[PDB]
Amino acid sequence: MPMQMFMQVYDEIQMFLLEELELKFDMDPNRVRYLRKMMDTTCLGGKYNRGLTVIDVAESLLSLDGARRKRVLHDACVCGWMIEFLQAHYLVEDDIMDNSVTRRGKPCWYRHPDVTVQCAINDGLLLKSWTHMMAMHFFADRPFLQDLLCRFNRVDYTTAVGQLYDVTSMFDSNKLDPDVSQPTTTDFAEFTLSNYKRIVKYKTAYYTYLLPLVMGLIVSEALPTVDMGVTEELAMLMGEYFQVQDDVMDCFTPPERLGKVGTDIQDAKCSWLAVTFLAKASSAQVAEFKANYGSGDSEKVATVRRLYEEADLQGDYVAYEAAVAEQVKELIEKLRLCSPGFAASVETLWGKTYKRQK
Amino acid sequence: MPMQMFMQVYDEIQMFLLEELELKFDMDPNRVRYLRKMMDTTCLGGKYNRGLTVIDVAESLLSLDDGARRKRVLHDACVCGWMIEFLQAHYLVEDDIMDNSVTRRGKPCWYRHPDVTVQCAINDGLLLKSWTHMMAMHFFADRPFLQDLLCRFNRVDYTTAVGQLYDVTSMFDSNKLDPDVSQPTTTDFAEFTLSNYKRIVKYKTAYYTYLLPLVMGLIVSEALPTVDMGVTEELAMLMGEYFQVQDDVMDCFTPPERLGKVGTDIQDAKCSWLAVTFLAKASSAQVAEFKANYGSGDSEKVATVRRLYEEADLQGDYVAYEAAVAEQVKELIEKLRLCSPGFAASVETLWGKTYKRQK
Numbered sequence: 001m002p003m004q005m006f007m008q009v010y011d012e013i014q015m016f017l018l019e020e021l022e023l024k025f026d027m028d029p030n031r032v033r034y035l036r037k038m039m040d041t042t043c044l045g046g047k048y049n050r051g052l053t054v055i056d057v058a059e060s061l062l063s064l065d066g067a068r069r070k071r072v073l074h075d076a077c078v079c080g081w082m083i084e085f086l087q088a089h090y091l092v093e094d095d096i097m098d099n100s101v102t103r104r105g106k107p108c109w110y111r112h113p114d115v116t117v118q119c120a121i122n123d124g125l126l127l128k129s130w131t132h133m134m135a136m137h138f139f140a141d142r143p144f145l146q147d148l149l150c151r152f153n154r155v156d157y158t159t160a161v162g163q164l165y166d167v168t169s170m171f172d173s174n175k176l177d178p179d180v181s182q183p184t185t186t187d188f189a190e191f192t193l194s195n196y197k198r199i200v201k202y203k204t205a206y207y208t209y210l211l212p213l214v215m216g217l218i219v220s221e222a223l224p225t226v227d228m229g230v231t232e233e234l235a236m237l238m239g240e241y242f243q244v245q246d247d248v249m250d251c252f253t254p255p256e257r258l259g260k261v262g263t264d265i266q267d268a269k270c271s272w273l274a275v276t277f278l279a280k281a282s283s284a285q286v287a288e289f290k291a292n293y294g295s296g297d298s299e300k301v302a303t304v305r306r307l308y309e310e311a312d313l314q315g316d317y318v319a320y321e322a323a324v325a326e327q328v329k330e331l332i333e334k335l336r337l338c339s340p341g342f343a344a345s346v347e348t349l350w351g352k353t354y355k356r357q358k
Numbered sequence: 359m360p361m362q363m364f365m366q367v368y369d370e371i372q373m374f375l376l377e378e379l380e381l382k383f384d385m386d387p388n389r390v391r392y393l394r395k396m397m398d399t400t401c402l403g404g405k406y407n408r409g410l411t412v413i414d415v416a417e418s419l420l421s422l423d424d425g426a427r428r429k430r431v432l433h434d435a436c437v438c439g440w441m442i443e444f445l446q447a448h449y450l451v452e453d454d455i456m457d458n459s460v461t462r463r464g465k466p467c468w469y470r471h472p473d474v475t476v477q478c479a480i481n482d483g484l485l486l487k488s489w490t491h492m493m494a495m496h497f498f499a500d501r502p503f504l505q506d507l508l509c510r511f512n513r514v515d516y517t518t519a520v521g522q523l524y525d526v527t528s529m530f531d532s533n534k535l536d537p538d539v540s541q542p543t544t545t546d547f548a549e550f551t552l553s554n555y556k557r558i559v560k561y562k563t564a565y566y567t568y569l570l571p572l573v574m575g576l577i578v579s580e581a582l583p584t585v586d587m588g589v590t591e592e593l594a595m596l597m598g599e600y601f602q603v604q605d606d607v608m609d610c611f612t613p614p615e616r617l618g619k620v621g622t623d624i625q626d627a628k629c630s631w632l633a634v635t636f637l638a639k640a641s642s643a644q645v646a647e648f649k650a651n652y653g654s655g656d657s658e659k660v661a662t663v664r665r666l667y668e669e670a671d672l673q674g675d676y677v678a679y680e681a682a683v684a685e686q687v688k689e690l691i692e693k694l695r696l697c698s699p700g701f702a703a704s705v706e707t708l709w710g711k712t713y714k715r716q717k
């Protein structure tokens with residue numbers, strides 16, 4: 001049911017956007033078709049966990065005429081597409097920044113045979129523009145519209161700042177200077193857990209966890225009813241854990257299962273694996289890592305992977321997850337006390353996250 | 359005076375942005391410093407024509423005042439002025455990447471800076487646009503016009519992105535546009551028409567460069583409905599097209615030391631005004647020579663393209679285009695003057711900064 005009404009709204013959104021282009025933007029059938037294809041390829045094919053979370057949060061809150069349930073759930077569907085379109089935008093641009101090769105089982109957008117890198121940058125930016133155009137059209141008469149967009153934009157800003165932390169994490173920040181080139185860091189002194197937690201809170205947690213929850217509360221007209229301090233705590237914790245999972249899968253999960261090929265080693269990413277290895281590694285192991293990290297060469301990449309599993313990273317990961325599960329379990333209860341329905345949706349979202357194989 | 363106040367507001371905006379980053383976004387001093395230099399390098403050093411137009415429009419409609427209104431309206435115009443300047447900073451960072459340009463305002467392009475990676479350049483560009491919204495929400499939090507301002511700003515942004523699509527695909531046979539299948543640069547140039555040129559330029563340039571500063575100037579001075587918008591838009595579209603025609607001509611013939619940037623249109627195979635105007639008047643032999651030399655980095659080939667443009671008397675065509683434009687502009691400004699004399703004057707001022715620009 002929820003996937004069926006979501007996909008119906010997708011066609012609703014797609015039709016508005018593409019007809020507007022024909023009718024008001026002097027667009028030709030060839031480019032309209034190109035953009036329809038761009039939209040489908042970049043926005044569909046995933047699990048829709050972000051978008052679906054908005055629907056479930058809204059559905060969980062309708063109580064605390066059947067025309068209202070219809071309206072609230074349709075609003076949740078549009079908001080769900082706002083986040084999925086936003087992540088579509090993120091993934092198109094990120095795939096360029098990360099020099100990735102596949103995504104969701106297909107080439108990355110920028111790697112598509114007739115998509116130029118210059119068009120791909122623009123296509124990715126069209127995706128974000130669509131998030132605002134859909135909000136403005138579908139929520140024109142909603143009083144929550146300003147708050148919604150104010151919050152969406154702040155989250156987007158936050159993610160961009162997080163992306164900056166990600167993309168500059170392998171350069172000595174003391175030597176960060178537009179006028180002067182600098183190679184990848186050689187001492188990895190900034191590959192700390194503290195610096196890792198910052199990247200991840202900003203690049204992943206706000207838009208992946210907080211935003212779907214907040215938008216669900218908004219379309220429900222239920223935002224002031226919850227503990228937003230507790231709610232943000234949960235989002236940050238779940239979001240960090242989600243990204244630790246992503247980093248671990250990048251290295252250890254066969255690409256066929258994930259739909260994408262991992263680039264973190266090659267890109268010299270400040271991943272969870274890297275910070276946790278270096279914090280506990282002997283000097284000899286750190287030497288090996290340094291001589292093999294941030295290179296395309298497959299044997300060097302295999303050597304890093306070898307180092308990770310020799311330093312018992314799976315030991316650290318099981319213990320991390322248990323510590324997270326513990327704190328998550330506790331915070332949901334704090335939430336349950338005053339917001340039983342919302343806590344239930346958060347609990348469902350956790351169920352989607354804990355020990356995911358994705 | 360306009361520049362004095364404008365530049366004071368720049369520091370105000372910069373301080374809000376960078377201190378929020380430090381206080382609320384856990385940013386370290388090194389990256390605060392990176393961002394400060396990115397902001398200054400990408401947003402400063404131009405002519406600020408878009409931004410200063412917002413101030414001029416507002417200052418013109420400032421008659422319809424004990425000083426408190428004036429103080430507020432002019433500060434709001436300065437903030438909107440920077441919104442557009444920061445939006446343009448965003449466009450230029452990403453556009454220089456897309457267009458494979460080398461220099462900008464006499465410096466390397468942002469993405470060409472020794473310590474800026476292409477991947478950071480892309481994100482930096484995106485941060486510049488985020489900043490337009492953040493400064494709006496901060497300075498205009500309590501303004502009734504906020505929602506309307508943000509709505510129009512956003513539509514114009516999207517319009518410009520659509521125009522950029524037109525620009526970047528204009529050298530690809532659109533019938534064969536297909537993500538799944540590779541395709542080379544057009545060999546027949548069948549789509550290098552004036553009709554397609556006018557659409558690229560209307561969307562990529564006219565809306566944000568001419569319409570938006572005027573509209574914003576009117577919004578902050580609370581005078582938007584006082585103006586014939588049909589005529590205003592007509593004016594913006596005409597001036598905006600002519601501005602881009604000037605940009606295309608300068609790309610080919612103006613030395614880069616005066617430009618500040620090295621032209622790429624011939625090399626990138628852009629559907630420029632020169633190209634479409636040349637193709638529409640050229641003999642078969644000329645067109646054949648054009649086809650053999652356009653869209654190449656080769657210094658000899660670009661030189662041949664420039665010569666063919668000279669041989670075709672495009673400089674003559676330009677003078678007549680410019681005269682046709684200037685006549686319509688003058689007439690439309692008079693149409694405006696009848697019921698909007700103050701706004702009409704600010705539009706005259708804008709045209710004056712446009713007409714026969716050396717740039």
Ligand SMILES: CCCCCCCOc1ccc[n+](CC(P(=O)(O)O)P(=O)(O)O)c1
Pocket residue numbers: 089090091093094095098100159160163166203204246250480481484
């Ligand atoms: C213009 C730049 C947009 C700014 C925000 C881009 C954010 O992109 C993000 C944020 C979080 C995760 N991801 C994708 C993850 P992926 O493993 O799905 O590529 P990554 O962090 O390992 O690269 C992309």
Ligand SMILES: CCCCCCCOc1ccc[n+](CC(P(=O)(O)O)P(=O)(O)O)c1
Pocket residue numbers: 121122125448449450452453454457459518519522562563605609
């Ligand atoms: C990545 C998404 C960006 C969205 C739209 C950016 C549009 O950029 C534009 C629009 C008009 C003029 N310019 C700069 C001009 P330039 O001669 O200063 O490079 P160009 O049109 O000849 O490339 C850039």
Ligand SMILES: [Mg+2]
Pocket residue numbers: 094095098100
């Ligand atoms: Mg990535």
Ligand SMILES: [Mg+2]
Pocket residue numbers: 094097098166
């Ligand atoms: Mg990434």
Ligand SMILES: [Mg+2]
Pocket residue numbers: 246247250
């Ligand atoms: Mg990843």
Ligand SMILES: [Mg+2]
Pocket residue numbers: 453456457525
């Ligand atoms: Mg361009």
Ligand SMILES: [Mg+2]
Pocket residue numbers: 453454457459
């Ligand atoms: Mg350019």
Ligand SMILES: [Mg+2]
Pocket residue numbers: 605606609
């Ligand atoms: Mg140009």
